[PDB]
Structures are given as structure tokens and as C-alpha cells.
């Protein structure tokens, strides 16, 4: 089994920059008959299948921007992006395409860097359909911030709650390279009805003053 070894495991840069990834095989991929190296690069964007960028180490598929360049020989291969763009956020895999069993590297994740950004925060009361179901979730959306680092503080009547809080970050955004995050505080209808003020507090290094968003159940 040929062993594919990619490096670095992760790589962060700014739009416009150039990057470089290493792929190293344990045996040579050169087909001396064809005088070609059978190394293939693939790009997997979040939630999509892998897409072929380059085969034979250096041959781009139709419609692959020439910002992408594959090079190398034998056991040492590198994928080169000349001007990284926001859309290029993905995991890049190389693939032994020379000898059964075909084998993949573990992939190199290309993350993006832009200016620090402040999150736009929205709160949402439980829906009347979920109250009828006997649950009660209070949702807070923190949208389009940078960095991914962000703390959400939930408070019920000025008192701090940390029991039903679930958080979910998006993958980085392929247009503005920001992150969003969804914080959900889930209570029973019973407890939800016995309190009134519901607040989410977004502390992000983009400022020292938290962003706060609140509602009163009685007004909902």
C-alpha cells in the first residue's frame, strides 16, 4: 500500500496571497512507460463531494482556474495556489493513482484570514408551535464575525443559565470568510413560563463591551 503524507495539516492565509502544500508518497508514482507521475489533487468544499483539480501531477481538468498548479515528481509533490480567493476554502487531498490499492493523503485544510469582525446578534423567542409541543427553545444568532472565537452568555431574569445551551458554528464563509454561530437555550415550557427576561450576551475580542440581545416573554 502506498502511503500519502500531506503537509501542513492546516494553513491560514489572506485573500490574494500564494500558498503551497506538500504531498509525499512512500513509493514512486512515476509510470516510466508513460513518463507521467500519477498523482491526483482533489478539492473538497464543505458538504460537497471531492472535485478533481489535477491529475498526472500537473494536468488541470477543464474549468479549473490556473491559480492552481500541481508540480513535482517521483515521491515529492506540491499543489500551488497563486492568488488564494475566499472561495478556495476547502480540504485538499492528494491521491496515489499509480498502484492498487489507490490511497489518499489525509488532506490539508485551507482556512482564510480577514479583518476581525463584530457579530450581528439576533434573539428569537420559542415558537408557538414548539410551546404547543411542550418544549421551549430560545435561539440567538451571532452572524459574520472573525475570529471563530466567541463566548455566548445566557441569562434568565439577570441570572446566569448554563444547562440547556447548545452551540453550533458554521463552516467559514466562502464569500466574506467570516463565521456564524447559533446558540440555543432549550427549556421546558413549564420553566420558560415561570420566568420573564431572556438574554444572550456575545463577548468577542472585537470589543470589550458585550453585545446583548433580550426579550420579555410577557411581551411575546
Amino acid at each position: 500500500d502506498i502511503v500519502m503524507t500531506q503537509s501542513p495539516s492546516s494553513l491560514s492565509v489572506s485573500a490574494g496571497e500564494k500558498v503551497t502544500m506538500s504531498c509525499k508518497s512512500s513509493q514512486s508514482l512515476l509510470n516510466s512507460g508513460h513518463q507521467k507521475n500519477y498523482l491526483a489533487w482533489y478539492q473538497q468544499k464543505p458538504g460537497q463531494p471531492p472535485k478533481l483539480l489535477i491529475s498526472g501531477a500537473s494536468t488541470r481538468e477543464s474549468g479549473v482556474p490556473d491559480r492552481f498548479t500541481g508540480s513535482g515528481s517521483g515521491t515529492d509533490f506540491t499543489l500551488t495556489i497563486s492568488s488564494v480567493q475566499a472561495e478556495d476554502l476547502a480540504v485538499y487531498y492528494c491521491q496515489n493513482d499509480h498502484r492498487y490499492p489507490l490511497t489518499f493523503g489525509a488532506g490539508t485544510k485551507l482556512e482564510l484570514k480577514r479583518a476581525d469582525a463584530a457579530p450581528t446578534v439576533s434573539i428569537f423567542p420559542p415558537s408557538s408551535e414548539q410551546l404547543t409541543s411542550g418544549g421551549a427553545s430560545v435561539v440567538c444568532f451571532l452572524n459574520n464575525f472573525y475570529p471563530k472565537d466567541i463566548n455566548v452568555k445566557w441569562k434568565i431574569d439577570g441570572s446566569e443559565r448554563q444547562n440547556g445551551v447548545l452551540n453550533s458554528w458554521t463552516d467559514q464563509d466562502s464569500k466574506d470568510s467570516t463565521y456564524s454561530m447559533s446558540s440555543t437555550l432549550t427549556l421546558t415550557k413549564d420553566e420558560y413560563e415561570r420566568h420573564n427576561s431572556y438574554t444572550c450576551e456575545a463577548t468577542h475580542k472585537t470589543s470589550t463591551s458585550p453585545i446583548v440581545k433580550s426579550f420579555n416573554r410577557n411581551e411575546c
Partner: protein
């Protein structure tokens, strides 16, 4: 152009077997081989095997010998993978891909397979609308909370795709054997509530689709 449509059971009971399908379109099925590929935990790509549709010739990864079995039906230009003796380690995404002179140059969209004795559960869909007395704002974020479903594959469409930008998909989290995800959209306030906004929640594993309209809390 070239197109590969995969089909198959997304929920399969432990120790049973599932047969995945891959329908080829836009090229001569029999001019190429079909590879199958396991992606586990969204991370590691392992090659399963090869099938030549002319000769029914197959080359397996030894790891997958006996587990997987490749077949084709040239009549309908469809390849089949059958996994057997299903186990929790078999839970993953399975891709088919066309293998010719340019390695795997077109991939199916993947069949997510979940091995589990649990039964299928369609999601509750709860609208997330600014309530109480919130600032109208220059824009407005609406959301849907997709709760209590199993297995995980769900897709949320907003207004049949018309509002595809400014959409955030928040990855699902598993809690007490059920998944919950949410999905936010942000639109001009000139848009909502004057115009109807709907989230369409398709859960194929249960053959359920659920349209929830995002309704204002009071008159404007």
C-alpha cells in the same frame, strides 16, 4: 454534463446489508471504470474498489474484501455497491466516481449510510421570527429550527432557492439519539414581512417535506 446519481438506504440495521446505486449520465458508461470510496467522519477518504463494466472485472482493497461487492447493470448504466454484515464502523458517506485516464474525475454526491437499530424520526420545524417588540432594522434575520430527527441528512431550502445567498447552515448536533440543526437567512426589511418567506425542510430518510412560513408576530 457528466452526472452520477447515487441512491440507497440511509438507515440500515446492524448486521444487515445495504445495496447502494450509482446512475451514470452524460458519457458512455462502459468506456470507464467506476471506483467506490468511503469517507468516514467527514475526514479520511479510503478507496474501496474498482469495477470494469465491460468484463465485470473487480479489484478490491483488501480491507473491504467481503464487506463490499461491486456490480454493474450496463442496461441502465448503473453501478451497485453492496455492503454486508453492517456494523457501526460501516457508518459513513459512500461515493462512486468515474475512473479513467484522469483518475477520479467525476464523483457522485455520496450516499450517507447510518448503521443503527433506531427507527427513523422526521424533524419538527419551528420558525424563528423576530418577536415581541424588536427594531425593524435595515435587514432582518429569520430562521428555522429543525429538531428531533433521525438519521441526519436534512436539507433546508429558503423560498425555493430565491434567497440562497445570506443563508447560514448550522451543522447538526446529536443529543439523546436525535439530531437538531438550524438554518438562518437574512433579507432586507423591505422584503419581510411584506413578502412570504418559507423554509422547506426535506428529510428523505422519512420521505417527509415540511414547509413552514415565517409569520410576523403582530400587524405592522
Amino acid at each position: 454534463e457528466v452526472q452520477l446519481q447515487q441512491f440507497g438506504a440511509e438507515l440500515v440495521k446492524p448486521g444487515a446489508s445495504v445495496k447502494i446505486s450509482c446512475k451514470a449520465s452524460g458519457y458512455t458508461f462502459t468506456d470507464y471504470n467506476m471506483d467506490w470510496v468511503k469517507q468516514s467522519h467527514g475526514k479520511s477518504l479510503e478507496w474501496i474498489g474498482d469495477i470494469n463494466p465491460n468484463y465485470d472485472s473487480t479489484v478490491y482493497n483488501q480491507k473491504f474484501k467481503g464487506k463490499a461487492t461491486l456490480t454493474v447493470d450496463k442496461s441502465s448504466s448503473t453501478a451497485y455497491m453492496e455492503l454486508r454484515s453492517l456494523t457501526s464502523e460501516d457508518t459513513a458517506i459512500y461515493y462512486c466516481a468515474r475512473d479513467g485516464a484522469y483518475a477520479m474525475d467525476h464523483w457522485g454526491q455520496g450516499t450517507s449510510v447510518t448503521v443503527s437499530s433506531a427507527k427513523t424520526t422526521p424533524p419538527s420545524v419551528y420558525p424563528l421570527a423576530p418577536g415581541c417588540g424588536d427594531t425593524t432594522g435595515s435587514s432582518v434575520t429569520l430562521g428555522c429550527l429543525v429538531k428531533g430527527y433521525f438519521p441526519e441528512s436534512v436539507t433546508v431550502t429558503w423560498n425555493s432557492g430565491s434567497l440562497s445567498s445570506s443563508v447560514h447552515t448550522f451543522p447538526a448536533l446529536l443529543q439523546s439519539g436525535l439530531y437538531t440543526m438550524s438554518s438562518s437567512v437574512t433579507v432586507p426589511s423591505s422584503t419581510w414581512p411584506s413578502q412570504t418567506v418559507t423554509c422547506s425542510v426535506a428529510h428523505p430518510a422519512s420521505s417527509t417535506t415540511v414547509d413552514k412560513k415565517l409569520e410576523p408576530s403582530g400587524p405592522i
